[PDB]
Amino acid sequence: GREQWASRLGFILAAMGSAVGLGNIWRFSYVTGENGGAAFLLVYLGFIALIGIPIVLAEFTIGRRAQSDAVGSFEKLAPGKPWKVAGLMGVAAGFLILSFYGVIAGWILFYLFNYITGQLWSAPAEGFGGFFEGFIANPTLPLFWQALFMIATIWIVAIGVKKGIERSNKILMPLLGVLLIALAIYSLTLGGAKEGLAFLFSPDWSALKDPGVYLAAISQAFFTLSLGMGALITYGSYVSKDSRLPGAAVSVAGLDTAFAIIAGIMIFPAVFALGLSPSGGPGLVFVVLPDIFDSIRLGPIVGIAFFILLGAAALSSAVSLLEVPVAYFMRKFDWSRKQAAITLGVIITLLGIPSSLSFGVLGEVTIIPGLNIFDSVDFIASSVFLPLGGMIIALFIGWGWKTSDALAESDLTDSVWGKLWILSLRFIAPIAILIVFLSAF
Ligand SMILES: CCCCCCCCCO[C@@H]1O[C@H](CO)[C@@H](O)[C@H](O)[C@H]1O
Ligand SMILES: CCCCCCCCCO[C@@H]1O[C@H](CO)[C@@H](O)[C@H](O)[C@H]1O
Ligand SMILES: CCCCCCCCCO[C@@H]1O[C@H](CO)[C@@H](O)[C@H](O)[C@H]1O
Ligand SMILES: CCCCCCCCCO[C@@H]1O[C@H](CO)[C@@H](O)[C@H](O)[C@H]1O
Ligand SMILES: CCCCCCCCCO[C@@H]1O[C@H](CO)[C@@H](O)[C@H](O)[C@H]1O
Ligand SMILES: CCCCCCCCCO[C@@H]1O[C@H](CO)[C@@H](O)[C@H](O)[C@H]1O
Ligand SMILES: CCCCCCCCCO[C@@H]1O[C@H](CO)[C@@H](O)[C@H](O)[C@H]1O
Ligand SMILES: CCCCCCCCCO[C@@H]1O[C@H](CO)[C@@H](O)[C@H](O)[C@H]1O
Ligand SMILES: CC(C)[C@H](N)C(=O)O
Ligand code: NA
Ligand code: NA
Hints:
Elements: H1 10-19, H2 22-33, H3 38-66, H4 72-77, H5 85-116, H6 127-137, H7 141-159, H8 161-165, H9 172-188, H10 193-201, H11 212-224, H12 231-236, H13 245-273, H14 284-294, H15 299-333, H16 337-357, H17 373-399, H18 403-409, H19 416-440
Helix pairs in contact: 1-13, 1-15, 2-11, 2-13, 3-11, 3-13, 3-17, 3-19, 5-7, 5-15, 5-16, 5-17, 7-15, 7-16, 9-13, 9-15, 10-13, 11-17, 11-19, 14-15, 15-16, 16-17, 17-19
This protein binds nonyl beta-D-glucopyranoside (8 copies), valine and sodium ion (2 copies).
One nonyl beta-D-glucopyranoside binds next to helix 9.
């Protein structure tokens, strides 16, 4: 006797809460900026349409049918089969992603603290770039704020699905978009819009010759949709029978893509107006936006709101990440929810400490050749486990299910979409993923 979404539309809300977070504004902005912009944008969008939405629906189908955890969904639906390797990577990918996800979310809480104590209202003596660099170089200051965020994440997973995950404030997410739209409009007036919008919407096709622009595009697409980290199989596993999955998948992926494109329209016109380079790294939004808030008379109020709402959004995504291992360890080892929540939460926190330290004292240490600890874990998680696990998931429903079962449990029977959906999982998605791995590696 396990959990289910109490309210009807609690599923689409929780799935949208998982998808929308730091990946849309933080990671989308610097991965776009260091990949040329528009050409990477057209590739990232095509991957969302032809691969992302089929696998989003695929993960919902596996979860609802099996009614188990990220790994248990494969033991039940296909006993004794090696398909379950897709679920182990997702649990592994959830661990790795949440370790450094909490670091970036700690930067959010630190910036929210400085606008609340009036510290960042005016520009600091060293500039917003120098001020940000001083903070992420500090060894222990970020570990405090990352631990604070993890406590909030541990608290909400421990409370439960019905009492915590489903009980999130549902007005915070529309408010973030309303604030992103208004910051998009304002930044369009800052004078770098012609250069910023050509960067984002006028393609330089030369980038299409680098096999790294596809892997980066497929990493960002899986990352931003919470694909391949066992998150959508778990949330699907709390879903009842009379649930229309296809529209939920299109609604999850469509709303998520709107946030990224509005985040891009906000950031890159602001990047060029400030004279900076769009290849500014993970601190891109963390250096651009405090400068933008300073050019507004009521910017301090804008900054408090922007970091509360984004902070609320990062919290709901991190809650969906920790629930994947939490759900797994409850079944495998009979741990209670609170037991698994604090145990795996404290652990994942300590795994993120080396990632946090790589922006400062550990800045020189490299794991993967050419990449520090943070870039190494992000590469192993985003660029290997998510597309591979995402590829095994597609092959799983494509060649491991009776067609009638797939279309039935997906609510796509006798549909032109159901024929194109099977086409995606059987051929297009696993073929294109394998091609991107081969060219890039
Ligand atoms: C028990 C409640 C405690 C809540 C936390 C209060 C944080 C107060 C921080 O204020 C800051 O302190 C600095 C010196 O300490 C000043 O230089 C700075 O100008 C000021 O903005
Ligand atoms: C619960 C909140 C915890 C906040 C902890 C912040 C730790 C910052 C310590 O300051 C550091 O002290 C050194 C002297 O030892 C200086 O040389 C160094 O310049 C300075 O960066
Ligand atoms: C409900 C959460 C409240 C907890 C507040 C924790 C305060 C952390 C204080 O650290 C200090 O913050 C200063 C900013 O003013 C920095 O200048 C300084 O380097 C750093 O040592
Ligand atoms: C980093 C450590 C911080 C983690 C905080 C975890 C708080 C867990 C609270 O959970 C709930 O507390 C109630 C107490 O009455 C129980 O009745 C209920 O069953 C339980 O679900
Ligand atoms: C709900 C949507 C809110 C959109 C907010 C857009 C605010 C943009 C204001 O820009 C400023 O406007 C002045 C004239 O209006 C100019 O003199 C000034 O140079 C310009 O920088
Ligand atoms: C809020 C939505 C804004 C949509 C912006 C899409 C238009 C991007 C076009 O970029 C460039 O604009 C320059 C302006 O002259 C042209 O010279 C150049 O040829 C063109 O490539
Ligand atoms: C959010 C809605 C945005 C709509 C998409 C805007 C399309 C911008 C078209 O740029 C075009 O790129 C070409 C390079 O291939 C140039 O040849 C051409 O001169 C230039 O105009
Ligand atoms: C919920 C809305 C969040 C976005 C708000 C957009 C900021 C509007 C900025 O307008 C004006 O721009 C001028 C810049 O020159 C300032 O001098 C002026 O004082 C400021 O008020
Ligand atoms: C769960 C998290 C990775 C979410 N997909 C994001 O875009 O931030
Ligand atoms: Na996202
Ligand atoms: Na979220």
